[PDB]
Each structure stands twice: as structure tokens, then as C-alpha cells.
Write a protein that binds this ligand. Structure first.
Ligand SMILES: C[C@]12CC[C@@H]3c4ccc(O)cc4CC[C@H]3[C@@H]1CC[C@@H]2O
Ligand SMILES: C[C@]12CC[C@@H]3c4ccc(O)cc4CC[C@H]3[C@@H]1CC[C@@H]2O
Lengths: 11, 223, 231, 11
């Protein structure tokens, strides 16, 4: 659950 | 998405361009400036990618993958493009214009500077246009990790788009094909530079010369 | 020189092709990390001798100073070996035909530490060649492009020859009946593969340097100097 | 000269 992964879905 | 006109592909890519960021006004301070910069640029790169037509249609597993493979290639071609007007110097930021000999300030760095400068010189001899640049960069994102059918369709449309720009510039067929090849052979040299840069950034991470952010750390570890 | 027709350019390139060489694979014993590396580098060393002569037969190459010839070959040698391997492997899904008596799958790659991930990239590149139906005429063009391109921005005569190889690739696609749009699309797909080959080359180089540095295999002087040229 | 500079000269 890498950083880049959630950054890929913001607002 | 795949049904954009050539101009809609150009418009959309020019529209998605990240901002040019600034730096702050020795080996540890120069690596600090560079890596601090790249870190902030990476955050703007994530958002740019999602605006590259076709990109958000992929799973997130593949989105992560392509960005991890390509991110330094992407910083570097951006760097080279900014430096095009400044023979012998690299415009990392508008207030961070480094000429070749400043690369010697960091161990191993001056050889990567030379490769970047040679590429910029190459953009200059080709008279690369901004519309072509945004194409190459999108190509890097979708191409570089693509093998590690839909994205081959998106790649074909970006090729269509490059050709359209060349046709529109009044180039003959023979000249279109020749310039398309010249432009794409340069991606081979940018891959080379990325691989060497990655090896340099890793040696610095192990030597503890500089603090590196979490994002930057994870992008480096994917390699 | 630059006066070759597209077809003259193709013939000269087909003519100049090196042999497919054999490994000295010894089947009496199992592989170890050291004997596999021994085999691969022994093979590469002999292919290198043929590559030197092949390159002199690539139009324009011998017109360069000896220093530029040295530089381009030092820069591209593992890329050229690698694209050869991938082409030899086209017909063998899941396998890499290093030699006709040395056909290795990914599980044999695992014998050499760090090797299996490089096998994997090479195997994937061979699939790409397969799904594209890459032709021998396109292959010899690509391999020459690699020779002339990969060190060229360690910096104009070379650009004219490169331009001529492009003309030649297009001409073949036109000669195979592809539409005008398919010609530039395929031209691009082919050249984008060179990016992947550069990459595999850079990792391969890094890996070989690592084997040498651990004293896993002895390397011939040529291979050694080819490696120093790059870590 | 390096080894290769001299092999490149063989005819
Ligand atoms: C990754 C490095 C730091 C970040 C540098 C950078 C930083 C910002 C940028 O826009 C481009 C580049 C390309 C060169 C990069 C460097 C190559 C070696 C160094 O470790
Ligand atoms: C360079 C290596 C040894 C020689 C190998 C070879 C040897 C011969 C050949 O014709 C192709 C290749 C490609 C893969 C190469 C290997 C990749 C890593 C290993 O160190």
C-alpha cells in the first residue's frame, strides 16, 4: 500500500 | 480518449503540462537542492500523468508501474527541454542554472551532466518544438515500463500526433519519417541517462550524503 | 555509402550477418552459477570477434576514425548481442536460444544470482518481436541503428546514414503492403523497442560488472575492456 | 591503444 498508490487517487 | 483528433491530442498534452518549479536562493548542498527539487516535481508529475489521455483507463497497478519505471526519464527530458536555449548549461530551475563545471561539485555527477548537455545540444540541432516534446514525454510514460493492447493503441495515436505536427510544418513524407526516427532514437539515450542517474542516486542514498523524501525513496527502490 | 538504394542497403546488411555460434555447453555436469556465467561469457567473447568484423561491413562504419569505431562498439556491444539473442529466440516461447545447443528458460536463469530478472526482460522482448511478426530485414536494420546510434550523442555523417536506414525500413513496410499510417506506426513501435534494449543492456552491464567483481568468472581481455568502457 | 583499436584494423 504504497505511497504512489494512494497519491494516484486524491480529490 | 482514442477518439481525440491530432489537435485534441496536442491541446490536451499542452494543457496537462506541469508547472516549472523553483529552487532555493558543496556536495551535500547541491544534492540537497537537486533532490528536494525532484521530490516536489514528482508530486506534480503524478497529476500530469493522470491527464495524459488513456492513462487513467489503466488499473492503478499499471499506473504505479509505468510511473516508477519512467519517472527519472521524465524529469530528465523535462530538464533537457528547459536547457535547450542555454548551450552548456542545465536549467534545473529558473534560479538554478548550472553550467557544466558545477557538476564536478558532486562525485560522479559531471558525467551525467555531459550526457544531458549532449542531449540538449541534440534538441537544439533538431530544433525540437514544444508540441513534439510533450509527445515524447507522454511516449516515455506509456512506453518505458510497458513490457515489465489498449496502451499500444494510445501510443499509436501519439505517433499519429507527431506525424500530424510534422505534416503541418510542411515536411515531406520522407522528412516526416526521418524526423520521427531521429526523435525516437533520442529516447534510447534518455533511457541510458536514467539508468546511470538511478545508479548515481542509489550510491548517494547508501552514503548518507543527503536526506531523501519518502516518495523519492520509493521511486528509487522500484528500480 | 549514402548512394545505396533501399534494397542495396538491405542486401549489404543481410550479407554482413554473423554466424549463429555454438556454446561449449558440457552436459555431463549440472550448472553452477560459475559454469553458466563461464558459458555465457565464453560465447559472448566469440560473438564479439564476429561483431567487430560485422560492424566494418555496416555502410559508413569504416569511414569513421578508428576512435569513433571503438567508441560506438564499446557503447553498443551488449545491446547488439542482446537483440541478436532475442531475434534467435523469436521461435522459442519461454526460451532463450543463446546457441543451438544452449536453450535456456527462466528457471535456468535462477542459477546465476540476479540473472532471472534479466532473462525475463529478454523473454518479454522476444514475445514483443513475436506479436509484431518482426522480419529479418527489419531486424538487421534495427541492429545497425543500435550500432550507429547508442554512442552517437557522445558527440553528422552518422545521421545521414541513420536517415538512410529509416528510408530503408519504411520502404520495406511499403514493400510488405502496409498502409501509410501503418508505416509510421510500425516505424515507431520498432524504434521504441530500442529503449527496452538499452535498458536491458544497462542492467546486463551492471550484472556482469558484479560477476567480475565477485570473481565468479574469468573474463577475456576484450570483454574486460568492453566492460571497463562502461560502473 | 586498446585492444579493440588494434582488432578493428585486421583487414
Ligand atoms: C537523480 C539526480 C538528482 C535529481 C536530478 C534532477 C532533478 C530535477 C530535475 O528536473 C531533473 C533531474 C535530472 C537529473 C537528476 C540527478 C541525476 C543524478 C542525481 O542523483
Ligand atoms: C552479460 C551477461 C553474460 C553474457 C550474456 C550473453 C552472452 C551471449 C549473447 O550472445 C547474449 C547475451 C545476453 C545476456 C548476457 C548476460 C546478461 C548478464 C550477464 O552478466
Amino acid at each position: 500500500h504504497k505511497i504512489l498508490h494512494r497519491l494516484l487517487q486524491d480529490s | 480518449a482514442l477518439s481525440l483528433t491530432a489537435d485534441q491530442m496536442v491541446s490536451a498534452l499542452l494543457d496537462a503540462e506541469p508547472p516549472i518549479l523553483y529552487s532555493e536562493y558543496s556536495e551535500a548542498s547541491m544534492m540537497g537542492l537537486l533532490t528536494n527539487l525532484a521530490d516536489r516535481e514528482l508530486v506534480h508529475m503524478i497529476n500530469w500523468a493522470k491527464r495524459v489521455p488513456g492513462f487513467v483507463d489503466l488499473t492503478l497497478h499499471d499506473q504505479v508501474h509505468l510511473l516508477e519505471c519512467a519517472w527519472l526519464e521524465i524529469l530528465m527530458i523535462g530538464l533537457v527541454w528547459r536547457s535547450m536555449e542555454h548551450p552548456g548549461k542545465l536549467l534545473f530551475a529558473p534560479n538554478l542554472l548550472l553550467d557544466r563545471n558545477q557538476g564536478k561539485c558532486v562525485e560522479g555527477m559531471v558525467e551525467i551532466f555531459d550526457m544531458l548537455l549532449a542531449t540538449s545540444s541534440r534538441f537544439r540541432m533538431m530544433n525540437l518544438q514544444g508540441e513534439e516534446f510533450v509527445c515524447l514525454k507522454s511516449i516515455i510514460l506509456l512506453n518505458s515500463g510497458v513490457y515489465t493492447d489498449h496502451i499500444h493503441r494510445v501510443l499509436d495515436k501519439i505517433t499519429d500526433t507527431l506525424i500530424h505536427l510534422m505534416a503541418k510544418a510542411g515536411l515531406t513524407l520522407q522528412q516526416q519519417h526521418q524526423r520521427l526516427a531521429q526523435l525516437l532514437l533520442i529516447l534510447s539515450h534518455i533511457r541510458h541517462m536514467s539508468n546511470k542517474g538511478m545508479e548515481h542516486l542509489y550510491s548517494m542514498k547508501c552514503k548518507n550524503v543527503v536526506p531523501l523524501s519518502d516518495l523519492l525513496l520509493e521511486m528509487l527502490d522500484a528500480h
